[PDB]
Structure formats: structure tokens, C-alpha cells
Amino acid sequence: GLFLEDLAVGDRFDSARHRVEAAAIKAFAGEFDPQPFHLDEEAARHSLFGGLAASGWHTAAITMRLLVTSGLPLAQGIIGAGTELSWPNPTRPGDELHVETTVLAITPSKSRPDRAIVTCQSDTLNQRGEVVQRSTAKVVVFRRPL
Amino acid sequence: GLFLEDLAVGDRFDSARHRVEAAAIKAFAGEFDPQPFHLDEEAARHSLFGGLAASGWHTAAITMRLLVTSGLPLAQGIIGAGTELSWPNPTRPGDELHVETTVLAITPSKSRPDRAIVTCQSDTLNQRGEVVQRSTAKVVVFRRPL
């Protein structure tokens, strides 16, 4: 349960792991990203992904779950204002993902000194050390109440 | 079914609508963003959201679904390289969302002339005309095959 006072530029955090399976890729895709390359193994082969890949939005959702449950231990939760998002490598069925987060900057509110905008860079990696997602997010973090 | 040739800077696209309900907010949150403010109406009241709000990642997923099924009519699908994401206003239970997308720029690949990186700015709006999400994405769009 970390508050603003416990954070410092350069702090690194690590989440537990999550295994991505084919059926979970199709279940999420079927509901929020129903495109051939995320729904069918044959149709995916003939796409840029050349094989089943998870929706970037499915990888982003799994990243938030890992962040919330283990990766970013904020006592008052994770409240995002915005983020710079990129997916360098596809997320594949069978992949073990975990997130590595680094605090890049802390910028206290001039107007409201009991909180700051903390820039957190989360890199979601598979077992091969490749980055399947980088999210440079600005989170709102308050100091521990009195 | 649009291809690269059919696109031009300034083009506007509109998706069909989607209604966000409390149970769907909790179902998605419970799986990918299990935080009090997205799971419980009482706990949410005492948060910055002051009331149930959907996870920004749930709004992003719904945005992709709308884009895929109606908002961005790309013949070969929507393949994202990265995006600038922000959530100006919370997404609330009972909200009717639709997406308005604008092409801001088309930048052909020097190395691979059969494709271009198209900058698409999608604004997800509720019935009050407020923006619950803005995603300035770079999508990979190829011209129609021979």
C-alpha cells in the first residue's frame, strides 16, 4: 500500500505472471475486437500477424489487471489521466506475461498539494524478454491521509 | 470496405451506439480492473469518481468494438502501431457511447509503398456530447491488392 510519499523517480515494480491462452484471446476478441487475426488461427496466418495474436486492447486489459493486483501497489488505486501506448511485438497464445513498471517523474499539483501526477512506464514482457506493450501513463497519486 | 486510396486527411467516420450498463462495468472490471470504484456503487461514491465509473480500459475496449464493427470501415481490418490515449470524463452506467473518428494525416511508407501509417483521432462521446475517451492512433493501412 504505497502513497505519494513512498514513491521516487527510478522506482521499479514488478507484477506476477499471467499466461495467455488461445481461447481467452478469442473470447476477448469476439466481444471487443472481432477481427479475423484475433479469432481464427487460419485467417491469422494470412495476415500481418501471420498467426493468432491477441488484440492490443486485450494485452492492455491484462496489463491493467496485473498492475492492479501486483504490479503497481498503490494504496488508493490506479487512476489514469492518460497514456502513451505502443505494441512492439504481438502477444501470442502460450505467452507468459508480467509487467515491469518504472517511475519516470513525479509532478506535484501546484493548485492541490495533496496529490501529484506520477509518470509510470509499464513494459509488458513475454518469456522471451520482448515487449508486447509499453504504456507510459500519468497516474494521479495522493499522499496518505491524516 | 475502405482501402488506402479511399482515405483523405479530414475524413470523418461515425460508429453505431452502445449502451454501458452497471453489470457490464462490474463484469469487465472484476476481470481486468478490479478496483472499488469500478466494482461497487458505495465504494465509488467515496472516490474521485464519486459514483460508479467504467474502467478507462473498458471504455477503450468498447471503443475498439465500435470501431471494428461500424466506426472505422477498413477492408483489411484495424492494425494499431500505437496511440495517444486520454479519458477526459468518466464513463457512467446508462451512458450511450458512439465514436467519431477523423483522419489527421496519411504518411506512406518510403520503404514499402503499398502501405501508409494513417493517424486516426477517435473521440468516444456520451449522449451529453462529452468526450469519455480520445485515442489518437496510428493505423497501418494498405492499398487494395491487385
Q: Dihedral sign for Cα B4, B5, B9, B14, please.
A: negative
Interface contact B33-A85, CB threshold 8 A: no
Question: How far, in whole angstroms, is CA A6 from its chain's centroid?
Answer: 21
CATH of the domain at B14: 3.10.129.10
Query: Do residues A58 and A27 make contact, with C-beta atoms less than 8 angstroms apart?
Result: no
Gap between the Cα atoms of A141 and A117, Å rounded: 6
Contacts of A128 (CB under 8 A, 6+ apart): none
Q: What are phi and psi of B49, to 5 degrees?
A: -70, -25
Q: Which amino acid is at A64?
A: M
Burial state string for B27-40 with b = 16 or more CB within 10 A and e = fewer than 16: ebbeebbbbebbbe
Tell me whether strands B18-19 and B96-108 are parallel, antiparallel or unpaired: antiparallel
Resolution (A): 2.3
B16, with CB counted inside 10 A (0-12, 13-18, 19+), is: exposed
User: How many CB pairs (< 8 A) connect A and B?
Assistant: 79
Sign of CA dihedral A8, A9, A10, A11: positive
End-to-end CA distance of chain A: 15
CB atoms within 10 A of CB A88: 13
**B31: Cα within 13 Å, side-chain hemisphere:** 15
Residue B141, CA atoms < 13 Å, CB-side half-sphere? 25
Give the residue carrying C-alpha cell 511485438: A89
C-alpha cell at B61: 475496449
Q: How far apart are CA A126 and CA A130, in angstroms?
A: 6
Q: Which three cell numbers stand for residue B10?
A: 479530414
How many domains does chain A contain in total? 1
Q: Where are the alpha helices (DSSP H) in chain B?
A: 22-32, 36-39, 41-45, 56-66
Chain A hits for B57, CB-CB cut-off 8 Å, are 57, 60-61, 64
**Which residues have a Cβ under 8 Å from the Cβ of A110 and sit 6 or more positions away?**
none
Q: Is B65 on the interface with A (CB under 8 A)?
A: yes
Q: What are phi and psi for residue B132, nearest 5 degrees?
A: -90, -10
Q: Is A94 on the interface with B (CB under 8 A)?
A: no
Task: Provide CB contacts within 8 A for A127, sequence distance 6+.
Answer: A95, A96
CA atoms within 13 A on the CB side of A38: 27
β-pairing verdict for A115-125 and A96-108 = antiparallel
Nearest to B135 by CA among B146, B125, B145: B125
In angstroms, what separates the C-alpha of A8 from chain B's closest C-alpha?
23
Q: What is the DSSP letter of A144?
A: P
Phi-psi sector, A113: left (phi>0), alpha (psi -120 to 50), beta: alpha
Distance from CA of A68 to the nearest CA of B (A): 7
Domain range spanning residue A116? 1-146
Q: Mark yes or no for CB contact B55/A64 under 8 Å.
A: yes
* Phi, psi (deg, nearest 5) at residue A74: -70, 130
Torsion of CA A134, B68, B131, B96, to 10 degrees: -130
Give the Cα separation of B110 and B120 in Å (integer).
Answer: 20
Scanning every residue of chain A, which has its alpha carbon at the shortest distance from the alpha carbon of B63? A32
